[PDB]
Subunit: 154 residues, 6 copies
């Protein structure tokens, strides 16, 4: 079902350090998207290496892993129709320098290696990333009071 | 004259229900556009049938009318140069999933059937829409104190 | 009974002029109060003179009436528990210079004669102000979707 | 020793339902308090019955537990000087009708039974709430880059 | 003349460093107070020592001076009725731990030594501080288009 | 170096009059760009004519000069990677009617002549403008505590 589509959003160490946690949550919360999982974590290197498994072997991999463990991150799971595509459109382009005002990276970032937040690039990655960072017990399913005002009835 | 242009903006039932009336108003108010008519109303079906007259005969028509009578609406008239087109642009695309961050629909909506606000799509239709939801007596003309700083006549 | 309580809130001409209509509405709308009536209006002198009846004859009365008709106002009826008192508290003190930061007048005003907004001072005067500024047909009754989350039963 | 003080802040089910999670976090985040633990949870009746242990036997107790399990909550631990007392001051008074504008409850709540958020009332009370809601492994130790500018020195 | 009362407001080094410049300005700009002088500066010890002349005898004074030269400050002169006392009110109490929510210090500070901003305590201090930090040529006198809406003409 | 890049940003008289000074500063400040020079000034014709030299000879030139001496301006220098380009993008298109929501002009403006703000269009003109409006003694050198979180290690 469309409305049960989920995406993994993660505030990176720079996002936490710069006090942007609330702001990242705000963009999703005000949109009518539903937060079904959340936690602050000081991830281990091994958990991040699997997350960035696609980048293993590249010259910047070590630097990326150490940087991503230089501070704690905030893991989130958002649910709602097309939340994967809308999610990353709300974050902006990968590069803050190509991101427009109104987006998170366009509003708050400059360097690509300090882009404060991560969003799953597809439904496939989202389902994978959700299972990597969270256990099914951490997913809190609920119904919004505003559901019928956010979504069109069948 | 350019500056006398007017458009009809209406916060739909979902916008009122989700506590978005002030935000819709903020977008136009901070832009320098001038509010000249405003009211909350729970319109009759007869009035809504005339508003969506061109949609009469469609299979979703009866349901639309029931949805637009399921909660009150806030009716508005804003005046200023190119307000019709700028208003639409500020609302976003008709579909929230194609609307950009920074727009009302891009920031707060997901489903097209719950896109929170309506804006006249053209000057011709604006004049029609205004004459329909408001009497001439409800229009309140005034001159903004910021007029010479928002507009440049020499 | 308690939730049914209503108050009359009005953005004065200086409030409309200074672009503060959305900020006044927000204070109430984000608090969980329910907007049941709303309209922009250019009230005539007679209406305003009835509203400020007790002040007729004061040296500043004519000037007061001129000011209240120098631009449009935004009329509102908000509904909810203790909305009269909480409304007044949100607007701040009548004198902006005695209003705390966080209140509308504390955040946006200086002169008492330019205090952007009015709120009924009691349930009795709210009932009076509401029937003066609005007709019963302009009051739209509905049920907020967040009602069970704003109020305990 | 003073800067290590911690408090437990919890967004209740009405807070999440009304979209106020980010706003609660903001008040603490912008103040300079360090977020050291955070999670969304759907606690079971046993955990809540322990949290509200003093209220057992009250006629409203069963209803209170069902309400507190009617939707998920967001649990938090903030760290910083005098954070327990300031945290309470930022939330407002337990009763929203006694909370001033600028505080969380004063800005967003009306009923004491739907007062959107909870804060530990004392150091000793926080330490107990923290260990009850969080394992020590969920507490993340870190140094803020703005430390020398928030604290002296 | 009460409307022409001026006060000296300065964003301290922690304020600049924590990105709170726009927020301190917003509090006054928003209130209807008029910005008549503004500048970023890295004052030398002699100027600061004179600015804090009353605290000259205290044991912490030298440490206060070196802290005030550890980063730049944003100097401001605001104008309006009772601006000195209201300015102070808006900043909060000297001590952030005694400042209420809604005030600058109550919203953003914790330590009294990192209370992000300074405001003149009286008209006499204001006048002394203005002429110390600014020259009359830097004081830009102007009339606000909103004057007749912020103030009663009487 | 990329990060050392600077651009001149100026709040025009309409921006000051409309109380948008804090908003213009916020866009850059929250982005992570660094404020290194700031001042309110009532520039004389000679300076304004030098700033707008490219437009000398145009029929509207005198009127432009009159308008720019109509009220005070706020002069700023912002430092950071690609700040000239990103600054312009954050301001919006020259014409407010062609500016997107989320940009300064798209959010607050209507007329091209009342577009509240100016930003240098290139590095070359940025260097010229900064020297014109500010002396080197007015530029404040400092290091931001969020630097390692705004910019990549190296």
């Amino acid at each position: 079902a469309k409305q049960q589509e989920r995406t993994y959003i993660m505030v990176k160490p720079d996002g936490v350090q710069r006090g942007l946690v609330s702001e990242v949550i705000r963009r999703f919360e005000q949109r009518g998207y539903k937060l079904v999982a959340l936690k602050m974590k000081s991830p281990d290197a091994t958990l991040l290496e699997e997350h960035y498994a696609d980048l293993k072997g590249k010259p910047f991999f070590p630097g990326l892993i150490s940087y991503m463990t230089s501070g704690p991150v905030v893991c989130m799971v958002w649910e709602g129709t097309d939340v994967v595509k809308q999610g990353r459109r709300m974050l902006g382009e990968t590069r803050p320098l190509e991101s427009n005002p109104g987006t998170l990276r366009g509003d708050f970032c400059i360097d690509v290696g300090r882009n404060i937040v991560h969003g799953s690039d597809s439904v496939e990655s989202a389902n994978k990333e959700i299972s990597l960072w969270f256990t099914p017990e951490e997913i809190c399913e609920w119904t919004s009071a505003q559901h019928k005002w956010v979504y069109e009835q069948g």
